[PDB]
Amino acid sequence: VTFDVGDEYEIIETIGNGAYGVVSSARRRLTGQQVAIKKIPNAFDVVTNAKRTLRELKILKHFKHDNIIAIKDILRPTVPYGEFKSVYVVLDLMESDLHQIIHSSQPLTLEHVRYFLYQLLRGLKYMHSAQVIHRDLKPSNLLVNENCELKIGDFGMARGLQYFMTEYVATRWYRAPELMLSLHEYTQAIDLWSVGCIFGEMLARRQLFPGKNYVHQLQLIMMVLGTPSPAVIQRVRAYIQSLPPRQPVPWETVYPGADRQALSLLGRMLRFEPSARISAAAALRHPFLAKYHDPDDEPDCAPPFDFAFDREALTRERIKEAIVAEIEDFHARRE
Numbered sequence: 001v002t003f004d005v006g007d008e009y010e011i012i013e014t015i016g017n018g019a020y021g022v023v024s025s026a027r028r029r030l031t032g033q034q035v036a037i038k039k040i041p042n043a044f045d046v047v048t049n050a051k052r053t054l055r056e057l058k059i060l061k062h063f064k065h066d067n068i069i070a071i072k073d074i075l076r077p078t079v080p081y082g083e084f085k086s087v088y089v090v091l092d093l094m095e096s097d098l099h100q101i102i103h104s105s106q107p108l109t110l111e112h113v114r115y116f117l118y119q120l121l122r123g124l125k126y127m128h129s130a131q132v133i134h135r136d137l138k139p140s141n142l143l144v145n146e147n148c149e150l151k152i153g154d155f156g157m158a159r160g161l162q163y164f165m166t167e168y169v170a171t172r173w174y175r176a177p178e179l180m181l182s183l184h185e186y187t188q189a190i191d192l193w194s195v196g197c198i199f200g201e202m203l204a205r206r207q208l209f210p211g212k213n214y215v216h217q218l219q220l221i222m223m224v225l226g227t228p229s230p231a232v233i234q235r236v237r238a239y240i241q242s243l244p245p246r247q248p249v250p251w252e253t254v255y256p257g258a259d260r261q262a263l264s265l266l267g268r269m270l271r272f273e274p275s276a277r278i279s280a281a282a283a284l285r286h287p288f289l290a291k292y293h294d295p296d297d298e299p300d301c302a303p304p305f306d307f308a309f310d311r312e313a314l315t316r317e318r319i320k321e322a323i324v325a326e327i328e329d330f331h332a333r334r335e
């Protein structure tokens with residue numbers, strides 16, 4: 001079967017795969033309400049993964065927000081603690097993600113784009129007030145349904161306030177320059193870079209900076225934003241120091257026929273300097289999102305999120321203990 005849940009849920013279809021692991025749509029037995037169930041097959045075998053899972057449970061259990069994917073249940077172990085391998089999390093089931101929507105024959109008007117961006121930023125304002133950087137925002141991590149309701153998901157990369165830049169890789173289309181040309185101060189401005197990229201992706205329905213490798217990535221950014229001012233720098237320095245004085249291409253020539261306000265907002269997000277970028281809070285006060293802006297319906301998260309548990313260097317078994325403790329804690333609060 002490979003999905004041995006109880007009689008509380010009824011599996012419908014298998015939707016697909018995270019890197020680890022499996023997501024099936026289901027139906028709660030008593031309410032008939034549709035949920036999504038993620039099985040994590042060997043959740044405690046690999047220290048790095050177990051750490052991700054623990055991290056992601058804590059952040060989701062901390063957040064209550066219409067624009068951030070949510071945990072509805074975590075299933076108890078149905079076997080002894082020693083034998084417990086696979087963890088099942090019940091989450092909000094959405095109908096698609098934003099990647100499928102952008103890259104489809106269906107039409108995508110500015111009204112869609114405007115509404116999708118508003119929800120994204122409303123979600124991030126809450127996160128960032130909790131002092132949680134998402135770090136991996138992309139359209140496939142933005143879940144969506146028929147009535148354009150949007151939810152941010154996948155917090156496995158999230159961080160408070162090692163990794164290596166491998167060359168031949170095309171997986172950094174939404175990564176902020178500070179994570180590339182490694183500056184020593186990483187803040188929540190990181191997500192607003194990715195938002196800019198995502199935003200722009202919707203306006204053209206095609207990737208803004210689709211780099212094929214590490215270098216092609218920095219080239220593509222430079223081709224639009226120009227060279228970063230000397231001050232905005234400091235081995236890696238050399239590659240850029242000697243490259244003809246590049247000027248920023250205006251966003252109007254990048255997107256011909258686009259909306260004046262949309263670009264004003266976009267231009268406040270895609271900027272090398274992390275401090276130069278708008279915050280999510282401020283972005284919501286932009287004319288572009290004026291239709292939707294409601295001060296009394298765009299809350300912060302309090303208290304903020306402690307990352308103590310993450311810093312601590314834990315064994316494989318001690319992370320299993322902590323994850324199990326999150327499951328027991330989850331049920332204690334509800335029941």
Ligand SMILES: COc1cc(C(=O)N2CCC(N3CCN(C)CC3)CC2)ccc1Nc1ncc2c(n1)N(C1CCCC1)c1ccccc1C(=O)N2C
Pocket residue numbers: 014015016017018023036037038069091092093094095096097100140141142143153154
């Ligand atoms: C029917 O629901 C969806 C379809 C799709 C979708 O259109 N595709 C395109 C075709 C994809 N192929 C890869 C898998 N193969 C079986 C062929 C289909 C599946 C994803 C995307 C998101 C969907 N909805 C969805 N709802 C909830 C999700 C989630 N996705 N997912 C997806 C669950 C499938 C893989 C990820 C999430 C994605 C990012 C972050 C969080 C989640 C998440 O935790 N949940 C619970």
